[PDB]
Design a protein around this ligand. Sequence first.
Ligand SMILES: Nc1nccc(-c2c(-c3ccc(F)cc3)ncn2C2CCNCC2)n1
Lengths: 21, 349
Amino acid sequence: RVYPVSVPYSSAVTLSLVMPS
Amino acid sequence: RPTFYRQELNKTIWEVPERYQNLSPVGSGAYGSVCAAFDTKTGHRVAVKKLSRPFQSIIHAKRTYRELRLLKHMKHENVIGLLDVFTPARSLEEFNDVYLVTHLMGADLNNIVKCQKLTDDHVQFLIYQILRGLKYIHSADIIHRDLKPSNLAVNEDCELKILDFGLARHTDDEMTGYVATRWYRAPEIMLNWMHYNQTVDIWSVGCIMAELLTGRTLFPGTDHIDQLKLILRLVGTPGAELLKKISSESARNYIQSLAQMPKMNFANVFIGANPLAVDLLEKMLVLDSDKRITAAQALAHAYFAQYHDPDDEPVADPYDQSFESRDLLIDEWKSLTYDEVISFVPPPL
Ligand SMILES: Nc1nccc(-c2c(-c3ccc(F)cc3)ncn2C2CCNCC2)n1
């Protein structure tokens, strides 16, 4: 079975997460 | 002694130093519940955990001591450590309740994967921070044993800390979160194949990484056999060596009962993934515990090239686990725990 990644990788800078309420 | 105050919270009573204000529940932790608070002495947001009936059984009391000793020892950016530990009791004789304090974290990875898609850059940094904490824990001869997304605390800026490490001890023991724990458990512990070691934790990181990339549980087994079916479906059936390394002749007879499944090529499974991420997964999810990459080796893997720093990936100080072999009464575990609460020195302000 295949499990594709949520966000395909792209070839190329600060990270954030939306917090649950 | 500080002045304490009292307040009821999710139908239990909380008695805390007045420095801790605005207590607000944010759920349950290992054997207890947690409130957010604001610490008017330092200006920090803290999480305060009240242990649940810490001395109402030998198992509970020994687990209380274990947990307090661990949390006092852990001093690492990616492992939960202790800002404060207190009790409203003025002496051993009235000692009943234990509260632990750490820096407030905003969420856990379980709730994170449940409400957003993660990019490869998030996955890189999140997994890096897990392996970095794990290199530390493992250097002190501690095994987490229950690594799962809900045990990984994160903030809005992707900072991560491991928690509930070293608290499990037997697969014969009743615990909360059992079904989720199993999804990330290395097969040899689940099914008691052999004496296991710390590589169990790397299997768990592989499961978590696969999940952060795809947003879906990699092996959502319903019971022990189903869980095993799902695992072998991906990694294949155990080759030559591994069957020669299963003392558990019960598992062994069951296993060779199963018709051969081949090993899938992960590149063909995880479509759209960074090949570096795929290649790390290949190294973590190997059935043969002896062949899995270690935390320390994994940090040097090119997937983390952007974050890796050999001079800022520290090991831990020696940690004495000699109490683990001891067979004591509730009151002796209580007194040991009281000692540790009294000897606590808060970290550098
Ligand atoms: N929000 C937040 N921040 C840091 C830790 C926790 C925490 C504690 C905990 C541990 C030690 C301590 F000293 C104080 C708190 N135990 C479980 N959890 C979270 C685990 C994920 N679910 C919510 C509770 N929660």
